[PDB]
Design a protein around this ligand. Structure first.
Ligand SMILES: Nc1ncnc2c1ncn2[C@@H]1O[C@H](COP(=O)(O)OP(=O)(O)O)[C@@H](O)[C@H]1O
Ligand SMILES: [Zn+2]
Lengths: 155, 211, 503
RNA sequence: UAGUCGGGUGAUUAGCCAGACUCUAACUUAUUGAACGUAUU
């Protein structure tokens, strides 16, 4: 991990320098470059810059995956490395995963959840508390605080 | 083309200095309101309704960087390079397509009169005005070639079918000169002329109606 | 593990459900089953579910179509991207712009689906290392990436076909595993319980070859269901196979007397109705067995004629429609209307050999006969475009060198528009030829009347006489010429009554 | 209109209700390793 992070220090530096001037923010989760901007029609020129910079730096060894270059906007689904970005500009787990968690909690309410799926739900609710804290409060309202306390951590 | 009248220079233009500050820095949303009053949402070179539009510099910044932040060299032209390059007409064609032109050989709609330098035939083709000789004819031909007024089929065909769309109207109005008295026919001509102001091609239709 | 697959499958994931089914099946008397009755039933219901909409057409719940195509260093394209529509996509442009290249790439991609439907681990067609790599590319390899949609449970099926140039040390592999997985799902589910299979067809320029009934020992069995995939992406649909299949159907129908009703008669009737409805001139088709070689006869404009006496244009279109109808009928046995099955059909130059009268209705007839088929079509005609929505058109700029990233739709609505307008705007072609000197005569006239003062003189009268002699009296050109004459004689009597009072 | 976002109800991954968005334009992915959250500690 650290070797791969260092091998793209110059790539990250050049991309960030050339990308912040056009008002585009750039990140990389070590294999997955993310660009976003509030200015329309400026991201369409980024993949060519990425390709030419990769050729300049790594030659032919490192290259983009042209089948994995995805454009998106508020008209479509928006998720960055597993977290859905709402139309309200807030982080979320997505409607489908939040309904899945609701189904799991409802199953636990009636004692239809075995040990393995109970552990999976406690793990997923820890992750949900990390990503979307308001979901925990909403589930406390929906499924009562006592039931959530019995499932989640008690000490 | 159509005559363009100016107003006060926008207050954000003088806040920037040519040379030190590049053009891609400026905020266009503010230079545009002033380029919309002057043009009425129509191109300054072909009189097409501006659905895809960009700020055009009459003197290119590459050759003449000095006139980069000067309300007089600014213009509103159709097409958009930011929305992909599918435009062989007007400003984009002047900067990219035609090439090998002199800026003093192109009529400026800002100051020079386009009516006496260009004639719009009802067949949809613009030709230099009758009786033009010397530098005026050369300027008209250079403008027509560089701005591609005759050229890409999209503009020529749209302008032609715009002019021939009102040919029955022109025939019907002008065939009733003897039926109507001078004042009523005169006011009908004004009524017809002032409602083509909102129409797309300002001067092609105007040439077809008037005198 | 098992539980992750169960969580995904109960959420609607087709791949996870199939993985669970295959695993649980493996244990024959162990955990799982034969129709796993949870996992196999969910897979088959995913493939087979659908409802009849308000118009009477069956619509699958999870449609199958091609979403996106990326071409990297393929023929003339450095990097091209297309966003094909679900129902109809029409690619237009000049000659040598790459429409046939796009259809060829899509067909090469679909050949893997066909091959893995036919056989387990079957190998489809591959890109050529002699002509498909861009000649002036630096990398010396080409890619053809595709993404397929098969409902919400399988939203992306990425497949990439790659080939390195001849004499290159480093070779490039093809990522064809997801297509193999989807076709494995189709084939395995079909084996246990018959399901409707997709139809993949390519109709290139390679069609329209002469047709003689020279196919007797043709080796293969045309009744066999999986014969509908034989040479289905070669470019020329097997019309001889259709003739043999039709004669087989006729023999089985005339030699016969779950409901004691022959399904061969139903198939024959469906194909007959499709052929008669799509092809304009053909009204009825049958098989004659007296004069005891088998012959197929059609009614062309009220005259009973044989299948080899059709013209080039009524025989090519008939071959296309008949082949498509046969394959759809054979691949969709459980559908009430087999032509409502899903699939992808590529047609190159749909207006081939067709009169302008036939071009006004070919698209509508094809889409009415096959409503769930994704048609990807190229054309050289404004008449075909006038019957097609603007959003379905992907145009090539007239000054493209292959370095365009994304193909787009025109800015002008083409449906219901006049042919001259579509020619001028969409196709970038003058309505009146520019190379003919007689085409500039009306404009050259105007000038003469304006070079003077709206008034006829010697040379303007000479030009008007020339226009009279060439175009004629009833021609529109003379109508506009005399309209201009009358008008300019009128705006000058006006000018007269004005300058006189203006001094 | 689609498509997307997701606040609520719903023995609950489904169905429904309310609200909202629309650069030509998401497709939800990977461990035991790395880091993050959580629990023992
Ligand atoms: N390997 C290649 N390198 C470069 N150009 C190619 C290559 N293969 C084909 N072309 C070009 O691509 C075009 C192919 O035409 P085609 O795809 O059939 O277009 P259309 O459907 O418009 O007739 C031609 O203009 C040809 O010169
Ligand atoms: Zn213009």
């Amino acid at each position: 991990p650290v070797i791969s992070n260092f091998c793209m220090y110059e790539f990250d530096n050049r991309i960030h320098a050339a990308c912040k001037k056009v008002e585009i923010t750039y990140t990389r989760y070590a294999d997955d470059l993310t660009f976003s901007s509030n200015i329309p029609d400026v991201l369409k020129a980024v993949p060519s810059t990425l390709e030419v910079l990769l050729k300049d730096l790594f030659g032919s060894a490192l290259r983009l995956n042209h089948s994995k270059t995805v454009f998106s906007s508020k008209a479509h689904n928006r998720h960055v490395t597993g977290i859905t970005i709402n139309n309200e500009e807030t982080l979320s787990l997505g409607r489908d995963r939040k309904r899945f968690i609701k189904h799991l909690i409802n199953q636990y309410k009636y004692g239809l959840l075995d040990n393995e799926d109970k552990a999976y739900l406690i793990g997923l609710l820890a992750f949900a508390s990390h990503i979307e804290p308001s979901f925990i409060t909403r589930m406390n309202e929906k499924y009562s605080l006592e039931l959530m306390e019995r499932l989640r951590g008690q000490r | 083309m159509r005559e363009l009248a100016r107003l006060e220079r926008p207050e954000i233009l003088d806040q920037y200095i040519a040379g030190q500050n590049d053009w891609m820095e400026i905020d266009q949303s503010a230079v545009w309101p002033k380029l919309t009053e002057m043009q009425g949402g129509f191109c300054a070179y072909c009189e097409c309704r501006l659905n895809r539009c960009h700020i055009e510099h009459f003197r290119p910044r590459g050759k003449f960087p000095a006139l980069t932040f000067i309300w007089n060299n600014l213009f509103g032209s159709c097409g958009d390079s930011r929305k992909s390059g599918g435009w062989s007409r007007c400003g984009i064609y002047k900067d990219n397509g035609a090439g090998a032109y002199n800026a003093d050989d192109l009529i400026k709609p800002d100051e020079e009169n386009p009516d006496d330098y260009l004639l719009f035939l009802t067949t949809g083709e613009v030709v230099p005005a009758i009786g033009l000789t010397g530098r005026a004819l050369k300027k008209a031909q250079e403008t027509i070639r560089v701005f591609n007024l005759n050229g890409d089929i999209k503009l020529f065909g749209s302008r032609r079918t715009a002019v021939q769309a009102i040919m029955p109207n022109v025939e019907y109005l002008y065939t009733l000169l003897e039926e109507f008295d001078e004042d009523d026919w005169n006011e009908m001509l004004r009524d017809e002329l002032e409602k083509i102001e909102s129409d797309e091609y300002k001067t092609a239709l105007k040439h077809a109606w008037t005198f | 593990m098992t539980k992750q697959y169960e969580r995904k499958a109960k959420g609607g994931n087709l791949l996870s459900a199939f993985e669970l089914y295959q695993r649980n099946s493996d244990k024959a008397p162990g955990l799982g089953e034969m129709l796993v009755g949870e996992w196999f039933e969910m897979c088959r219901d995913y493939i087979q579910d659908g409802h009849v909409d308000e118009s009477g057409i069956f619509r699958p719940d999870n449609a199958f179509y091609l979403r996106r195509l990326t071409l990297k260093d393929f023929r003339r394209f450095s990097l091209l991207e297309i966003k094909l529509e679900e129902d109809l996509t029409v690619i237009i442009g000049n000659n040598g712009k790459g429409k046939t290249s796009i259809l060829y790439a899509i067909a090469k991609t679909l050949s893997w689906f066909v091959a893995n439907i036919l056989k387990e681990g079957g190998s489809g067609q591959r890109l050529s290392e002699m002509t498909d790599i861009k000649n002036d590319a630096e990398d010396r390899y080409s890619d053809v990436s595709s993404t397929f949609f098969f409902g919400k449970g399988l939203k992306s099926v990425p497949i990439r076909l790659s080939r390195s140039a001849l004499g290159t040390a480093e070779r490039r592999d093809s990522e064809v595993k997801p297509a193999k997985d989807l076709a494995d799902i189709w084939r395995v589910i079909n084996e246990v319980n018959t399901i409707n299979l997709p139809t993949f067809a390519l109709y290139n320029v390679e069609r329209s070859q002469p047709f003689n009934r020279n196919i007797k020992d043709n080796t293969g069995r045309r009744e066999e269901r999986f014969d509908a995939y034989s040479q289905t992406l070669g470019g020329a649909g097997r019309f001889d196979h259709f003739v043999e299949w039709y004669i087989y159907l006729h023999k089985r129908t005339v030699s016969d007397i779950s409901s004691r009703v022959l399904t061969e008669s139903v198939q024959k009737s469906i194909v007959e109705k499709a052929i008669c409805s799509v092809v304009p001139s053909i009204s009825n088709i049958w098989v004659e067995m007296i004069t005891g070689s088998d012959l197929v006869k059609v009614t062309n404009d009220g005259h009973d004629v044989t299948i080899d006496q059709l013209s080039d244009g009524q025989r090519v279109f008939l071959s296309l429609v008949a082949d498509l109808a046969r394959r759809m009928v054979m691949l969709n046995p459980l559908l009430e209307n087999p032509l409502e099955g899903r699939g992808i059909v590529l047609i190159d130059q749909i207006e081939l050999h067709l009169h302008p009268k036939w071009q006004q209705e070919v698209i509508l007839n094809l889409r009415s006969a096959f409503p769930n088929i994704q048609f990807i079509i190229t054309t050289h005609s404004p008449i075909v475009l006038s019957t097609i929505e603007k959003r379905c058109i992907r145009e090539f700029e007239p000054n493209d060198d292959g370095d365009q990233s994304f193909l787009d739709s025109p800015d002008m609505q083409t449906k219901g528009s006049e042919n001259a307008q579509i020619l001028e705007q969409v196709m970038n072609v003058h309505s009146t030829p520019p190379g003919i000197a007689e085409s500039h005569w009306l404009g050259n006239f105007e000038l003469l009347l304006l070079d003077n003062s709206g008034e006829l003189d010697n040379h303007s009268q000479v030009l008007y006489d020339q226009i009279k002699a060439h175009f004629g009296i009833d021609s529109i050109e003379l109508k506009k010429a005399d309209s201009l004459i009358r008008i300019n004689k009128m705006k000058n009597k006006l000018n007269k009554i004005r300058a006189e009072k203006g001094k």
